[PDB]
Amino acid sequence: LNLLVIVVDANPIWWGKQALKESQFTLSKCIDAVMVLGNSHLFMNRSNKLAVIASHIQESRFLYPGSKDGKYELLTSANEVIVEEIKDLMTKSDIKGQHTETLLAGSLAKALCYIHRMNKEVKDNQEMKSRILVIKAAEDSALQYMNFMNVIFAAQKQNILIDACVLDSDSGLLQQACDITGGLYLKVPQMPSLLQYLLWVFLPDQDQRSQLILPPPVHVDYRAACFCHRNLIEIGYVCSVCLSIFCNFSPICTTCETAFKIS
Template structure:
């Protein structure tokens, strides 16, 4: 009877049915100039609405699905969800120092960041409470970020490297939270273990998604690539959805970490379709799916001297610094090593081509035919 009604399904152990926790960290490029250029096709309000649908779909997978959202602004990176316990209300003030009124900022203290820190509005019977909490936190934080942005902050660059560093730090913190305690044995009986040690240790599937609307800034090449290599070492894929152009460094980030890079510059209005079909599956589910791949990856680097993206440059053999032109006195600007240029700039030697010897013709034909015979084809005698 158990085989008919499949009641054995309910007798399985909890360890087989538990879902592995999944953390999705989203970095939103909030460059005002870039969003103003996309205002006719995709306003930032509609982009945030589509992004909230994507976040709710990720959270709806299960109770072990978690999300963290950051804003990469022109001069700083700001937490949108969960909200920081010490919001940056006055960016011009120094961190951890007195502001002149006797008050001191405590932004350098290690304060726990939890989901309960967000302001929870009135609950609605038609919306899941966590969805309402995430939406309220994102909208309030974005409104505060826009209100605190002045005309002096309107730079063409975006601090993506700082947002990546915060995302990696938060991921590392959450990973330690889900780690199970190590096994401990009884000194009197080394073979015995505590009941807590018999449970399987849980892992965390984490990934980072960048919503980019601006090009890569050459000045951010070194810190960005340092964060990319750290993510690759931690096996955290970095996905990128570009709404404008194809950022060079983010292409390399997706290639190095095994993430997905998509460019929606041709149709920014299809943002939700790109998010749902290209980035909803986590790293484990992608092993069973056919994910989008990059046909061409821009591997150009930025030079250390002028911060320009170059195709060909000079590389120091000691510290691997890249220069667009030969430094003064042929010395590396980073480590001071004397660079040996060898015969750089000399004209290549031209070797004359050897002339082929002409074979002697016999009876109007060459001595060797296509058949490989040493003599010509015999002519029949009449």
């Protein structure tokens, strides 16, 4: 079976900037598209299961743990729960000017541990191939690099595919993230037509991904930079303690305070 987890980056600052701009694309349509993708995923097979996570500057909250319109009961429950919970989360939110960058690393951490919990509870007879369909919508924060890298390595070890679906911006950190675990990376430029992309590129699971034509991966610039400047550097002088990329040879690296002996 397959356990899909959709990490929606619903950053109120950026999405409300769209709302002010009165652009055609809106967070409501984005949520509807993600809802449709989840419904189709569960449509694929009974054993398949999904989950949803919403991201905010403060925290990240799960959006998912008759036939009035003649509808399938389970997908009806999914529709109602996600709609109500997302409206609640967006309507109620404190204001903190100091912190406005969207949070994604913690959401991915919650996702990863959730997949671990499901993998433990599920019967050993059936093998579960989990996936994380990250949907970024705003620029990332510089301060989150270390934690995001740790969670990405945890995902690599645990065999989970981070399928990034960034839109309106190309986060080098997120593209680097998906490259490590081998997840696909699609940058949709036509936001109104986003859902056609998900039902074709992302929706197919790892089992059939290899035997299918999908957009080629984007080149990843694995840049390195000194802590002095944050500028690209091809030669780094790291020590045996900090393991920090530095600019030029120095008597002692500041972040270490070690008694380096010249030679």
